Design a protein around this ligand. Structure first.
Ligand SMILES: [Mg+2]
Length: 299
């Protein structure tokens, strides 16, 4: 059909040794059985940090998406064709990024970013590069999750670390020498806020595209990807935060140009699940604190 369906979802699967009461094991089952995550070609996952919950989620997704990477930064073995950048076996947490596909994966590279900030500096953040074979066409998908806005960053502003990380992605793409007739897609939680910024040419939002040499997609669906006013987990953690637009799937302008590319923010609600936290009982109807972004690429 000349249509690629790529989805990205930050799934809030924090390690159960630090954040034990967040329904990780249960949400792995709910997500695996959910409707919204069906019918895609490729799904990018962020925040699959918890060992068990993530194996279980990746295991539930095996039926529709049997071609899978390992989780970024969890190992450096032969599950990866190559491991690049500042990878370290001693930093406590992995990078939380995995890519799953219905189509065979010809090549799997992990890259760990050089610079980090605050708690992210204990992480192994980066990107996962995949080259995917979809009917005699090769498409390239980079899945990432950039430095978060953190108070504990210090004199290092988080925006400046993100600019660095984006340059790392772009240099990897430039020196990968990918034919300009193939599609190069970059997806994930970029931690760069579209809201109130889509009309300033010097915003961090406008710079992201310039730094990646990437085109601006068309936007449909909900107006925020992280939204304390509609989402039960984000309301619990940050009841008075304004809504943020942080998650993206975008195409490199130096390679194949789509006839169109759409980013649609979905708002699916899960079955009720409940947790006990600080002696009180809480019930949620969300899969995660982020909403998923479904991208449609017309090739
Ligand atoms: Mg988060």
């Amino acid at each position: 059909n000349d249509t690629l369906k790529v989805m990205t979802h930050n799934v809030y699967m924090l390690s159960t040794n630090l954040y034990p009461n967040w329904g990780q094991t249960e949400r792995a089952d709910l997500i695996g059985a959910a409707d919204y995550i069906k019918n895609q070609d490729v799904v990018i996952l962020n925040e699959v940090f918890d060992a068990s919950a993530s194996d279980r989620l990746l295991g539930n997704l095996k039926k529709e998406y049997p071609n899978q990477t390992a989780v970024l930064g969890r190992s450096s073995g032969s599950e990866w064709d190559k491991t690049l950048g500042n990878y370290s076996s001693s930093t406590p947490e992995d990078g939380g990024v995995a890519i799953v596909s219905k189509w065979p994966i010809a090549e799997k590279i992990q890259y760990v970013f050089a610079k980090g900030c605050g708690p992210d500096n204990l992480s192994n953040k980066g990107f996962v590069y995949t080259k995917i074979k979809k009917n005699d066409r090769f498409v390239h998908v980079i899945g990432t999750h950039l430095q978060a806005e953190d108070s504990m960053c210090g004199k290092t502003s988080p925006a400046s670390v993100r600019t660095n990380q984006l340059k790392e992605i772009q240099d990897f793409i430039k020196n990968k020498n990918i034919p300009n007739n193939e599609y190069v897609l970059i997806g994930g939680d970029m931690n760069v806020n579209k809201i109130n910024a889509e009309n300033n040419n010097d915003s961090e939002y406008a710079s992201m595209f310039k730094t990646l040499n990437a085109s601006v997609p068309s936007y449909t669906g909900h107006t925020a990807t992280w939204d304390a006013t509609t989402n039960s987990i984000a309301k619990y953690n940050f009841p008075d935060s304004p809504a943020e637009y942080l998650d993206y799937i975008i195409a490199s302008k130096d390679h194949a140009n789509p006839s169109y590319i759409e980013n649609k923010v979905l708002q699916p609600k899960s079955p009720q699940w409940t947790v006990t936290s600080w002696f009180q009982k809480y019930t949620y109807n969300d899969y995660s604190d982020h909403y998923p972004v479904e991208a449609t690429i017309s090739m």
